[PDB]
Write a protein that binds this DNA or RNA. Structure first.
Ligand SMILES: Cn1cnc(N)c2ncnc1-2
Length: 231
DNA sequence: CCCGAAGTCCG
DNA sequence: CGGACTTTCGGG
């Protein structure tokens, strides 16, 4: 079975505009885990737009197929485009897509893709269906996969006043001993972000519970101005 | 325009 | 460790 024509068209059009000179530092920035074509986001968005204008966006029956085929292509711009395309199908994504999103998290994994999946697509799903959190989060924390662990930390990132504080702190407590940078930093990030909504609770948490030094410092990057740094 | 959100380099 | 500085991206 041939590649979906929309994906083939995108591949052809991206490749025709590749920039090997830019590709080298772009790939180095992601620690050479991926090949790059060398197309940065403004042009990459326009090239996608070009193909939608010519071909139209595929029927929703093909949504998951298109995403997978792009995920399987070697150059990282195709996963970035896949995520742009998933946003175009946003109104069709629901709680039944959690396993599909899980599989995207644990394939071609790195912070650029995982952070584009978790606080937005998964965050929205669990905001609407909080009763499903306990069907996934314990497994993610227990897994060997640091990107599922990061997903458990960051899916609430944008919740603001809808944050489940008890859940957030329980998740952080489970992962606070991790020596993995991407886990320590995610803990720092979600605490720093939630402190914009409720600084008192984050300050109390970091003063009274164990965290990696990186996590604590990132958490209080801003609110240390509000409380002061004791001698 | 601005500000806030990985990478290298240094002490 | 933790700060200074880097380029890119999202968004006010
Ligand atoms: C991706 N990226 C680029 N530049 C910065 N200053 C950043 N801080 C966090 N993440 C960043």
């Amino acid at each position: 079975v041939p590649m979906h024509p929309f994906v083939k068209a995108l591949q052809e059009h991206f490749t025709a505009h590749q920039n090997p000179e830019k590709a080298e530092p772009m790939a180095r920035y992601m620690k050479n885990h991926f090949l790059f074509l060398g197309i940065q986001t403004p042009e990459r968005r326009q090239l996608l737009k070009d193909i939608i204008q010519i071909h139209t966006l595929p029927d929703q029956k093909d949504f998951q197929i298109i995403i997978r085929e792009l995920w399987d292509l070697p150059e990282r711009e195709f996963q970035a485009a896949a995520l742009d395309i998933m946003q175009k199908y946003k109104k069709h994504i629901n709680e039944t897509h959690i396993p599909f999103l899980e599989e995207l998290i644990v394939t071609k994994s790195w912070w650029d893709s995982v952070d584009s999946i978790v606080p937005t697509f998964l965050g929205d799903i669990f905001l609407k269906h909080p009763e499903l959190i306990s069907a996934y989060i314990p497994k993610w924390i227990a897994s060997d996969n640091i990107w599922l662990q990061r997903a458990a930390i960051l899916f609430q990132l944008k919740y603001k006043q809808k944050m489940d504080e008890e859940l957030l702190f329980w998740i952080i407590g489970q992962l606070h001993s991790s020596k993995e940078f991407f886990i320590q930093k995610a803990i720092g990030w979600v605490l720093r972000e939630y402190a914009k909504t409720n600084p008192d609770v984050v300050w109390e948490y970091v003063q009274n519970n164990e965290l990696a030094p990186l996590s604590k410092r990132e958490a209080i990057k801003h609110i240390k101005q509000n409380y002061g740094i004791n001698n």
